[PDB]
Amino acid sequence: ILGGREAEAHARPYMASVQLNGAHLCGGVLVAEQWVLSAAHCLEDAADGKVQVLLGAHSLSQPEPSKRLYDVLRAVPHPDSQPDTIDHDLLLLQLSEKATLGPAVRPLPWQRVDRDVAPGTLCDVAGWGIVNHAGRRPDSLQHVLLPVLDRATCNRRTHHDGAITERLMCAESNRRDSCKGDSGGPLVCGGVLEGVVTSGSRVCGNRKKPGIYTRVASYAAWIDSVLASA
Numbered sequence: 001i002l003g004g005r006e007a008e009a010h011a012r013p014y015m016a017s018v019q020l021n022g023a024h025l026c027g028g029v030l031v032a033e034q035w036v037l038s039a040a041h042c043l044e045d046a047a048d049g050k051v052q053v054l055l056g057a058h059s060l061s062q063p064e065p066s067k068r069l070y071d072v073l074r075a076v077p078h079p080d081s082q083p084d085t086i087d088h089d090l091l092l093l094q095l096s097e098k099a100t101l102g103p104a105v106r107p108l109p110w111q112r113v114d115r116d117v118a119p120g121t122l123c124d125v126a127g128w129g130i131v132n133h134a135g136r137r138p139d140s141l142q143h144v145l146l147p148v149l150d151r152a153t154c155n156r157r158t159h160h161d162g163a164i165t166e167r168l169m170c171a172e173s174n175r176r177d178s179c180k181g182d183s184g185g186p187l188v189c190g191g192v193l194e195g196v197v198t199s200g201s202r203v204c205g206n207r208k209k210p211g212i213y214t215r216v217a218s219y220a221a222w223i224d225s226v227l228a229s230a
């Protein structure tokens, strides 16, 4: 997160760190007792690397009573995702067992109504991604409040030039933004999950290249079908 601040420890009990061979790779969000939602590019080249999900965390490195690193039974990328496109960039991780819930670990309700968030709505994004242009990695969770940017502005030639489909939404990126390592994490508006940070390479903190987020309401039937797979 560029331009943000340290999050209140455990105030976002749905936040997940998706890890590959014990290192933070991407954000994620606990959406059901046994399932974490994230982005597909995060793992597209992960091969047989060990994927785990850290829940109940603030610090990546320090012990905390609520912190638990879960193994993953199954990783389920969206079947229409592809390397090198921004579309359908969703991934579901089935934990090896249902998460132990409490005040620091709780699924986040997620949007099913497939209608746009009002322009300018202030939404929260959190993560453990880079915090400056040199790439410094924070030990603890950072966050920032970002206003939703209307799709037509986001689609101007000067911005994303028509790439923002109905299944995607934008948030402003002027000096406050999600950056490398924050992808896959949640964009939360009015206490409900609205978007998942896309995980393609994007410049960080340039107002002319807004943040792009996959709209979870647009993928409700897919999320429900993977969960019913259990």
Ligand SMILES: O=C(O)c1[nH]c2ccc(F)cc2c1NC(=O)[C@H]1C[C@@H]1c1ccccc1
Pocket: 024, 025, 026, 041, 042, 043, 044, 045, 128, 129, 130, 137, 138, 179, 180, 181, 182, 183, 198, 199, 200, 201
């Ligand atoms: O976050 C992302 O947008 C993103 N998209 C990807 C696509 C392929 C892919 F193989 C990885 C990624 C990845 N994450 C990362 O590279 C994580 C490694 C970097 C990181 C940055 C700051 C703090 C901790 C760790």
